[PDB]
Every structure is written in structure tokens, then in C-alpha cells.
């Protein structure tokens, strides 16, 4: 019932060194990898016990073939991109497709390509058109905007199938995805400086702050990033730094619960 999201990402790499696969594609529900394909295995496979257990061998067989297809297409598009740009070394092409389901039930959808980690092509499903960065992209958008059926399939998948799949996966992985693990919140000290630190919580979306003697908010608050602890939980911290003439307090919010702490 919180904002969730489905995303499938493709990555192609020309002239890759011994290790790097020429093509990798990966599926994700809110940062939980669910599916995987690469150029060595040439196989789509589950990246979660709950995906594996709940989909017949056909889904994987069927989508493996579809991804073998994309492999091939990216290999080719890469060479054409080189030929047009007069390129030379290992380059990257990438595509991201996906949808988001908000808590309020409304939806978003996204489809984008990138050459060398920079926006190349952005799809717009309300106007059935691509937007391109330079003529190279424009030229390849032109051909694409010719095929009307492809334009429409995308709108559909994004607006309809992507969500249907999200909903399924959410259910399929309920125990791990729709779970709530609250944080350990603590305060440590260290010019004298204090740190509100929280760890071992899920989901990762968390909000933290400091309130001046409960009244206002400290303007000057260094925020630690929210990082993965290793086990499926996340950890994060927030710091601030005159004999403390006004005693301070930490205010945190996770999964609907506003938490507070004094010193």
C-alpha cells in the first residue's frame, strides 16, 4: 500500500574486456533484484526465492528468448551508433523500462535510453513520441516513430501490463516487500558534535532531523546517506554540532511512526 515500482534495465558494452559480459539485463521491484540475463549464460533466471518458486519454467524459457532478442538488438545498435559517431573504444548503451504504483493507487510509467550514461532518448506515452538529444538519436527515433504498433505496445505495457506484474510480484514477495522493520535509533557524541544514528530498518525510505529544543529545526544538519547494512536492512545517521544553552532532540519518521529522542 506504499509506492512500489517495477523496472527492467538493459546494458550493452562494446569490445568488453575478458570479464565484462557484452550484454546484461536486470529486473527490480523497489531495489530488490527479481530477474537476471547476461551474454554468457544467455538465460533469464530468478534473483529471489519467491520469484523462482512462483513462476513455471515457461515464463523463464519464454522471456529468455525475448531477452536473447534484445541482446542481439543492442549488439547491433551499438555498432550503428559507433558508425554514426565515429567511435572507437568500449561504449555503453542502456535502456530502462518500468512503472510506479503510488499509495493512492494512481500510476507512473517510464522508458528511456542512454549512450555513455547520458540521456539519449526519452519516451512519452501520452504523446506517442520520442525526444532525442542529437541528430543521431533523432534519426533512430524517426524510424521508431514510424511503427505505430510499437508506439502503442509500449503505452500499454507501461500503463497496463507493468502494473499487473508489479501487483503479482508484490504478492509473490509479500513477506520481504510489504514487511515493516523499525529502526534502532541512538545518539552519540564527538568542537563538540552529536549524531542521531538509526540502523537495521526496512523499508529504506526514512526521514531524520533535529529540532531546536523541540521548537524549530536546526538549519545546519549534516545528513548521512541511507545505506544497505548487508542483511536486507538499511542504516542511516544525522549530525549537528555552546555548553548546549538549549538542550536538543532527534526526530525520525519510519513507516508512519514519528519517533523522538532527548539527551
Amino acid at each position: 500500500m506504499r509506492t512500489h515500482s517495477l523496472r527492467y534495465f538493459h546494458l550493452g558494452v562494446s569490445d568488453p574486456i575478458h570479464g565484462v559480459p557484452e550484454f546484461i539485463s536486470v529486473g527490480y521491484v523497489d531495489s530488490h533484484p527479481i530477474t537476471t540475463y547476461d551474454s554468457v549464460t544467455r538465460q533469464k533466471e530468478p534473483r529471489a526465492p519467491w520469484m523462482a518458486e512462483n513462476l513455471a519454467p515457461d515464463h523463464w524459457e519464454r522471456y529468455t528468448q525475448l531477452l536473447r532478442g534484445w541482446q542481439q538488438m543492442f549488439k547491433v545498435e551499438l555498432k550503428r551508433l559507433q558508425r554514426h559517431y565515429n567511435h572507437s573504444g568500449s561504449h555503453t548503451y542502456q535502456r530502462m523500462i518500468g512503472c510506479e504504483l503510488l499509495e493512492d493507487g494512481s500510476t507512473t510509467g517510464f522508458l528511456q535510453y542512454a549512450y555513455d550514461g547520458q540521456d539519449f532518448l526519452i519516451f512519452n506515452k501520452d504523446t506517442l513520441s520520442w525526444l532525442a538529444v542529437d541528430n543521431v538519436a533523432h534519426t533512430i527515433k524517426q524510424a521508431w516513430e514510424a511503427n505505430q504498433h510499437e508506439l502503442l505496445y509500449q503505452k500499454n505495457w507501461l500503463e497496463e501490463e507493468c502494473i499487473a506484474w508489479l501487483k503479482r510480484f508484490l504478492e509473490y514477495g509479500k513477506d520481504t516487500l510489504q514487511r515493516t522493520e523499525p529502526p534502532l535509533v541512538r545518539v552519540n557524541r564527538k568542537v563538540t558534535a552529536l549524531f542521531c544514528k538509526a540502523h537495521g530498518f526496512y523499508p529504506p525510505e526514512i526521514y531524520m532531523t533535529w529540532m531546536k529544543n523541540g521548537e524549530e529545526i536546526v538549519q545546519e544538519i549534516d545528513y548521512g546517506d541511507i545505506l544497505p547494512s548487508g542483511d536486507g536492512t538499511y542504516q542511516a545517521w544525522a549530525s549537528i554540532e555552546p555548553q548546549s544553552s538549549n538542550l536538543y532532540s532527534c526526530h525520525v519518521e519510519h513507516s508512519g511512526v514519528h519517533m523522538v529522542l532527548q539527551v
Partner: T-cell receptor
Framework: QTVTQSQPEMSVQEAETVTLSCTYD???????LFWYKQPPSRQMILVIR??????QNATENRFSVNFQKAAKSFSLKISDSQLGDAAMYFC???????????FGDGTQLVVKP | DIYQTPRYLVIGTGKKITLECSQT?????MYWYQQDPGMELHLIHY???????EKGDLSSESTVSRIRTEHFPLTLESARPSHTSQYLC????????????????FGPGTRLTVLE
């Protein structure tokens, strides 16, 4: 993953409408539906195309379809039959993610003048 | 539109057969089906573009090659009676997605008969 055309043979008078009947079985939601005709030439010829994401039933002049999605029914309607219409007609389903065009067993249409 | 040679071929058992299929619509996706008397059409080979050659529902001792866009030949090394069937090449217009949002157009087919 399956198409059924139960009517092995079928007949129509010149200038009459006839309905060829077909059901498919699937679980996919994103899919593609076709009719093809195979005159004794043994050449497959596309008759019409319907996408599952469209309500309005396709119409190619004299040819049209009754797409009852929920019934998984896909009938070809031939108005104003002509002698030329004579051929084997085939119902076909294709997933948006697999290439095999799945074919019905085929209904042979004979036109009486 | 799309061409297929031969349209009829009678041949002895165990000889090398090459069915040609060519197309000039700029179609990257190409297909090969097989229709034995009665039995329904079976995708035996397909391709997403140049140097793609993938297998299909039915399993086959034929082989395909896709050195270039226009041609998708099918080869049969030791030809045997069971191979006797109608082989229909085909091609489709999807180019910007791997997915099959298109309509497949068939060529005229090759009536093969292999005899002992």
C-alpha cells in the same frame, strides 16, 4: 497457447455474408489475433489483424471480425462473398513476447455461385 | 514481396537441400514454419536480425544462417523421407523492439518430397 476452428468445412452463396468461427485459449492479456487465407496456391495471405488492446473490431472493407475478448472468441465475418473468397481460412494467435504464430486447424470455405 | 525457391522439389534420400527465402522490405525479424499433410504449422527457425538464428517450438535437423538482412536460407544435410513437408518462410516489420508487435507476411512455400 492454443487455437480451435471446429468447422472443418463451410459454405456460402455469392453475395451472402458468412461467419467463420474461432476460439483461442491463453492466459496472457497482451496478444495478437489474425486471420489468414490459403488458396490452393498454398500461399498464406493475411486477411485481417486485431490487437487485444483494441475494442473496435477491425474492418477491411468487406472483411470484419467479432472480437469477444472475454469469450476468447474471434469470428471472421465476410460480407458480399465472391467466388475469389474461396480458400482455407486460418485463425491465428501470437503473443507479444514469442514469435510462433499459433494456427487453428483450418476451416475450408466453398463459394456457391 | 518475399521470395522462396524452389516452390516444388523432389529429391532422393540423403542429399543436401537448400531452400531459399529472400525479402526486400528491410525486415529484421524472419521466420520458417513447417506444415506436414494435416499437422498444423510449426515454427522451426526464427531470427531477430543479421547473425541471429534461434530455434522454435518444433525441433528440427535443419539449420539456418543469417549473414544478411535479405536472405534467411534453410539447409538440410542428410535429407530423409520424414522431412517431406511444406516449408513456409516469413518476415515481419518490427525493428525498434524485440517484442512481436507486428504482422507476419509469408512467402509462397516449398513443397519438398524426399524419396527412398
Amino acid at each position: 497457447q492454443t487455437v480451435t476452428q471446429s468447422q472443418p468445412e463451410m459454405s456460402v452463396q455469392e453475395a451472402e455474408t458468412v461467419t467463420l468461427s474461432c476460439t483461442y485459449d491463453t492466459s496472457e492479456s497482451d496478444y495478437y489475433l489474425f486471420w489468414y487465407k490459403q488458396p490452393p496456391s498454398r500461399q498464406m495471405i493475411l486477411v485481417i489483424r486485431q490487437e487485444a488492446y483494441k475494442q473496435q473490431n477491425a474492418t477491411e472493407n468487406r472483411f470484419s471480425v467479432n472480437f469477444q475478448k472475454a469469450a476468447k472468441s474471434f469470428s471472421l465475418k465476410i460480407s458480399d462473398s465472391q467466388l475469389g473468397d474461396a480458400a482455407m481460412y486460418f485463425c491465428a494467435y501470437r503473443s507479444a513476447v514469442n514469435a510462433r504464430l499459433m494456427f487453428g486447424d483450418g476451416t475450408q470455405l466453398v463459394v456457391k455461385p | 514481396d518475399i521470395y522462396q525457391t524452389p516452390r516444388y522439389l523432389v529429391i532422393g534420400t540423403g542429399k543436401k537441400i537448400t531452400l531459399e527465402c529472400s525479402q526486400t522490405m528491410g525486415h529484421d525479424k524472419m521466420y520458417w514454419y513447417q506444415q506436414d499433410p494435416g499437422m498444423e504449422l510449426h515454427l522451426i527457425h526464427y531470427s531477430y536480425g543479421v547473425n541471429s538464428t534461434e530455434k522454435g517450438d518444433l525441433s528440427s535437423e535443419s539449420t539456418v544462417s543469417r549473414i544478411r538482412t535479405e536472405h534467411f536460407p534453410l539447409t538440410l544435410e542428410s535429407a530423409r523421407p520424414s522431412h517431406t513437408s511444406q516449408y513456409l518462410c516469413a518476415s515481419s516489420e518490427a525493428r525498434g523492439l524485440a517484442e512481436f508487435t507486428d504482422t507476419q507476411y509469408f512467402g509462397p512455400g516449398t513443397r519438398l518430397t524426399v524419396l527412398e
